[PDB]
A paper describes a structure:
The study is based on structural and biophysical characterization of a key M16 family protease, FusC, resident inside the bacterial outer membrane. The crystal structure of FusC from Pectobacterium demonstrated the structural characteristics of an M16 protease and further revealed a plausible import mechanism for ferredoxin, an iron-bearing protein from plants. The first of these domains would correspond to the catalytically active β-subunit of MPP, housing the active site residues with a metal ion coordinated by two histidine residues (H80 and H84) and a glutamic acid (E165).
Alternatively, catalytically inactivated versions of MPP can be engineered by mutating a glutamate residue important for catalysis but not for metal binding. The equivalent glutamate residue in FusC, E83, was mutated to an alanine residue, and the FusC(E83A) mutant was used for structural analysis. SDS-PAGE analysis confirmed that both sets of crystals contained full-length ferredoxin in addition to FusC(E83A) or FusC. The structures of FusC:ferredoxin, FusC:ferredoxin (C2H5HgPO4), and FusC(E83A):ferredoxin were refined to 2.7, 2.3, and 1.9 Å, respectively. In these crystal forms, peptide densities were detected that correspond to the plant ferredoxin. These peptides define two distinct binding sites for ferredoxin in the cavity of the FusC structure. At binding site F2, segments of a ferredoxin molecule corresponding to the N-terminal 37 residues and the third β-strand of ferredoxin (residues 86–90) were visualized. The B-factors for the ferredoxin α-helix bound to this site are comparable to the rest of FusC, with a number of salt bridges between positively charged residues in FusC and negatively charged residues in ferredoxin contributing to this stability. The Kd of the FusC(E83A):ferredoxin complex was found to be 1.9 μM.
Numbering used by the authors:
A (entry chain A): 26 to 921
B (entry chain B): 2 to 37, 86 to 90
C (entry chain C): 85 to 91
């Protein structure tokens, strides 16, 4: 919507059979319409023999119907609708929502209502259609497998314990998807899909009179049948201290939490709007304070946060969560409990409450006098949120007044009282995630309450106060170095400058830079450099990157960059160090100045370091026993023999100090740098800033870091270790080959042709291929064609896949046709011209040029690249993509 | 093939490494980041 | 969650 439309007119209605509808006429944009229907049934309503059936019905109502034996979605496809973009369904615990955006907007309204009434009142739910649809539902079930989903179920089981939700995931079970008969879906549909259990909303360019005549036409005849009464949406709250582990052997989660559960909709005889306003004020106040409380946490805990979430229609959960140093879960839960007790002892900061409520009053004041206007998609979002809750929309103008009124009856003592109610909830829960094989015994409730009593009896210091904001400033730099030499590449608009400290500038005066400067600073200081310690170097690089200069902080660094619209980022790879940044040209001194400070005055923010150590430790604990850690180790032994480096043991990790890490960083920062600078400005503007900030950094010659090169030969392994029901097939092949721009393009062209041929050659659905990837490139640093073919597939015929792809490769060089190359050449030509004037391409080719030629020639003559694409050259290169003498095969199968 | 993903949350910027054949949230969970290219939510 | 958006 380009012209925002004002607050719409709402018309509500109810047919005789109980069907409810909401008509929302916007004055624009012309023809746009959005149509949605909710059936108040979700997975929570399934019986024990109905697992996944709410969601299966949401699929099946698009198949055969009374009016459409070939399927509702079939009919829609024939009239130009696309799945997802034009029609969609979403099922959750409580409700099923059908959404329609007809291609012709409001002209298609009647066809949309005929389709929706067919879906909700006349679905056949045929066994034949279900047996066809099971393919799609099984595929969604497979894609919802993995560690994130498994941990989400761990969390639901704990935080919603004693409710219907843990046993009712929306997707259901593999057995139910495979085995549930259409008859069960029909009974579920006939139980819940009734007009008094359904509601419709139409938003946009409509005539409310016409629309509701269309609604009567398609929905009035549905028989009025009641659905069962339901009062099972909440966990059964009771006074308790429940203790749970959140556990998955592939999860790096290392975390403790303490949670209160309570009825969040009880407003205690007061305005319910005012109650939700007290909740917002309380959460903002607590969020401010609990961040300050980070200074009380011992080394085993970090990042104490408070979160509030809905866990039923009326129940909420208020949780305190903190990351844990693996092995330190006992000390961490005690620290969480101490901080909770401190919140029971002391009132919330009165200045915060004043500031928070004043901020809300300002917004509410502005809302109350501003006519509400929105774009179409925003109206749909705002209206759908309230309609899904089955509540009327209240406009932002009215809500602004409502807030001002409620704010007048809110004092600090109301906030404190609201907060203490949550902390007094008798239904409580302690949760532990402990990664990998870390020794752990689930504490008994008595052990947790023993800590609560300890802190209840202890003397606790007041809540921490807000600390003064650090306002960072770059130092004055008055030492200047000198440029000692200039080499000119006028044809490429490049100058190369030698500086007195040994650095060099490769400056490209590209008009495509506009009013910005682009910096890429490279040196040979990868973390495999011989003077360094690989894991410590990588940790130091990341900590300096996030912390900024010694006298700053992670957060003052982020604020300072934002203010100057400036970026600068450290990336230390195995073989090189790259600092990359952009600034406006008027910020050039601030970009070079920050760059210099990272080199000579690196910082380590203690909060950032503590968090980074937690992250490394929990991943180490997981990787030591996970599937992913096992695969990485076996792939390493197959391709390289031994790892180049490894993360430390956790006990060594815990000993790391800031001076040790800064020592590593200074080893990287001493390597001489080439500054690739893209800036459309005169040298007279650039050179003084170069000489002041970049020529003055101490350097010492560094050696080149040897590349990490996969070993030659044929090796294979098969590991039955997967925890999902899938096979992963990986093959690597390489051929040494000198890098030229022409050869790289030819490799790329043959790759595209090979991918399509290998995919066509493995088209058979009987093979069970879920995903398939063919990668190949002439890697320019290693100067080898590196080819990688990847499979994910059902386990049954995984052993055959690489064999079929191996045969495809041997056929490829005689199956490539003149038309294939002609298509690819024309497609390359079109891409190459879209890369003209592209700054990302220009910067990459400049840097590649210096790597191979030590000059910028690659910025010129790109129009001749396509000429190296011929039928002969592509076929001769397709024959090098796969080299049978250098082949490593790794097959991962499900565990026995 | 190594990549880096970033997530903007009401908690802060969270950065995660992610291979080609891994879903965004599986990588976060493997890394031990509690959530529910730089995306948004 | 948030009843009056501040950010
Ligand atoms: Zn589905």
């Amino acid at each position: 919507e380009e012209i925002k439309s004002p607050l719409p007119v709402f018309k509500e209605g109810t047919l005789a059979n109980g069907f409810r509808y909401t008509l929302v006429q916007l004055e624009g944009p012309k023809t746009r319409v959005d149509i949605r229907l909710i059936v108040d049934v979700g997975s929570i309503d399934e019986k024990d023999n109905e697992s996944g059936v709410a969601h299966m019905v949401a699929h099946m109502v698009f198949r055969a119907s009374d009016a459409f034996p070939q399927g509702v979605s079939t009919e829609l496809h024939k009239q130009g609708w696309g799945r997802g973009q034009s029609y969609n369904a979403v099922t959750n615990y409580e409700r099923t929502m059908y959404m329609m955006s007809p291609p012709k907007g409001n002209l298609d309204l009647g066809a949309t209502l005929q389709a929706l009434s067919q879906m909700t009142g006349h679905a056949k739910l045929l066994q034949s259609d279900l047996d066809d649809e099971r393919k799609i539902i099984l595929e969604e079930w497979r894609g919802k497998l993995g560690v994130a989903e498994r941990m989400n179920q761990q969390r639901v089981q704990a935080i919603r314990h004693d409710s219907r939700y843990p046993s009712r995931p929306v997707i259901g079970t593999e057995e139910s998807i495979n085995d549930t008969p259409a008859s069960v879906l029909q009974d579920f549909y006939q139980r819940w899909y009734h007009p008094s259990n359904m509601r419709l909303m139409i938003i946009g360019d409509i005539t409310p009179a016409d629309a509701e005549r269309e609604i009567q036409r398609y929905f009035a005849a549905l028989p009025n049948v009641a659905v069962p009464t339901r009062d099972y949406y909440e966990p059964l709250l009771k006074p308790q201290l429940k203790v749970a582990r959140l556990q998955d052997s592939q999860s790096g989660s290392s975390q403790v939490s303490f949670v209160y559960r309570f009825n969040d909709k009880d407003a205690f005889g007061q305005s319910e709007y005012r109650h939700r306003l007290l909740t917002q004020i309380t959460m903002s106040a607590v969020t401010r304070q609990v961040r300050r409380q980070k200074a009380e946490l011992p080394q085993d805990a970090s990042s104490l946060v408070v979160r509030k979430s809905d866990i039923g229609k009326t129940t909420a959960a208020l949780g305190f969560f903190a990351n844990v140093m693996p092995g330190g879960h006992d000390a961490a839960i005690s620290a969480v409990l101490k901080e909770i007790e401190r919140f029971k002892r002391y009132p919330l900061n009165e200045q915060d409450i004043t500031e928070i409520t004043s901020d809300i009053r300002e917004v509410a004041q502005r809302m109350s006098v501003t006519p509400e206007t929105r774009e179409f998609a925003d109206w749909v979002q705002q209206l759908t949120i309230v309609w899904q809750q089955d509540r009327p929309y209240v406009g932002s103008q009215q809500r602004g007044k409502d807030a001002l009124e409620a704010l007048d009856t809110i004092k600090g003592e109301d906030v404190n009282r609201h907060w203490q109610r949550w902390l007094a909830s008798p239904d409580t829960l302690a949760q532990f995630s402990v990664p990998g094989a870390t020794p752990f015994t689930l504490p008994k409730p008595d052990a947790i309450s023993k800590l609560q009593k300890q802190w209840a009896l202890a003397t606790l210091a007041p809540l921490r106060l807000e600390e003064k904001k650090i306002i960072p400033e770059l130092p004055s730099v008055t030492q200047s170095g000198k440029r000692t030499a200039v080499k000119t590449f006028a044809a490429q608009k490049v100058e190369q400058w030698q500086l007195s400290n040994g650095d060099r500038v490769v400056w490209l005066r590209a008009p495509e830079a506009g009013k910005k400067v682009y910096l890429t600073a490279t040196s040979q200081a990868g973390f495999m450099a011989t003077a360094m310690n690989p894991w410590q170097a990588q940790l130091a690089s990341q900590l300096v990157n996030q912390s900024g200069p010694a006298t700053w902080s992670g957060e003052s660094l982020s604020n300072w960059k934002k203010e100057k619209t400036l970026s600068l980022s450290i990336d230390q790879e195995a073989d090189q160090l790259t600092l990359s940044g952009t600034a406006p040209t008027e910020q050039l001194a601030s970009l070079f100045g920050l760059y210099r400070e990272l080199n000579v005055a690196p910082g380590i923010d203690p909060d950032v370091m503590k968090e980074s150590m937690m992250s490394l430790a929990r991943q180490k604990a997981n990787d030591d026993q996970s599937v992913g850690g096992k695969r990485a180790s076996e792939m390493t032994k197959l391709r390289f023999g031994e790892p180049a480096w490894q993360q430390p043991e956790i006990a060594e990790l815990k000993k790391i100090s800031a001076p040790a890490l800064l020592s590593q960083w200074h080893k990287a920062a001493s390597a001489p740098v080439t500054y690739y600078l893209i800036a459309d400005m005169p040298a007279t503007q650039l050179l003084p800033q170069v000489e002041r900030y970049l020529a003055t950094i101490p350097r010492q010659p560094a050696s080149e870091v040897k590349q990490h090169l996969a070993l030659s030969g044929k090796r294979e392994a098969t590991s039955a270790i997967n925890v999902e029901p899938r096979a992963d097939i990986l093959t690597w092949s390489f051929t040494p080959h000198a890098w030229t721009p022409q050869a790289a393009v030819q490799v790329s062209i043959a790759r595209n042709i090979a991918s399509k041929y290998l995919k066509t050659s493995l088209r058979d659905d009987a093979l069970g291929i879920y995903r398939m990837r063919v990668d190949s490139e002439l890697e320019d640093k290693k100067q080898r064609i590196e080819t990688e073919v990847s499979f994910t597939s059902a386990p049954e015929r995984a052993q055959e896949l690489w064999t079929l792809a191996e045969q495809a490769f041997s056929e490829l060089p005689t199956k490539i046709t003149q038309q294939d190359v002609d298509e690819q050449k024309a497609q390359f030509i079109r891409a190459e011209k879209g890369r003209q004037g592209d700054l990302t391409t220009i910067q990459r080719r400049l840097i590649l040029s210096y790597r191979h030629y030590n000059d910028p020639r690659y910025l010129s003559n790109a129009s001749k690249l396509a000429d190296s694409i011929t039928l002969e050259s592509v076929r001769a290169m397709s024959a090098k993509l796969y080299n049978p003498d250098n082949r490593v095969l790794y097959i991962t199968l499900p565990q026995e | 093939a190594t990549y880096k993903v970033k997530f903007i949350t009401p908690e802060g910027e969270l950065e995660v490494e992610c291979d080609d054949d891994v879903y965004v949230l599986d990588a976060a969970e493997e890394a031990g980041i509690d959530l529910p290219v730089t995306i948004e939510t």
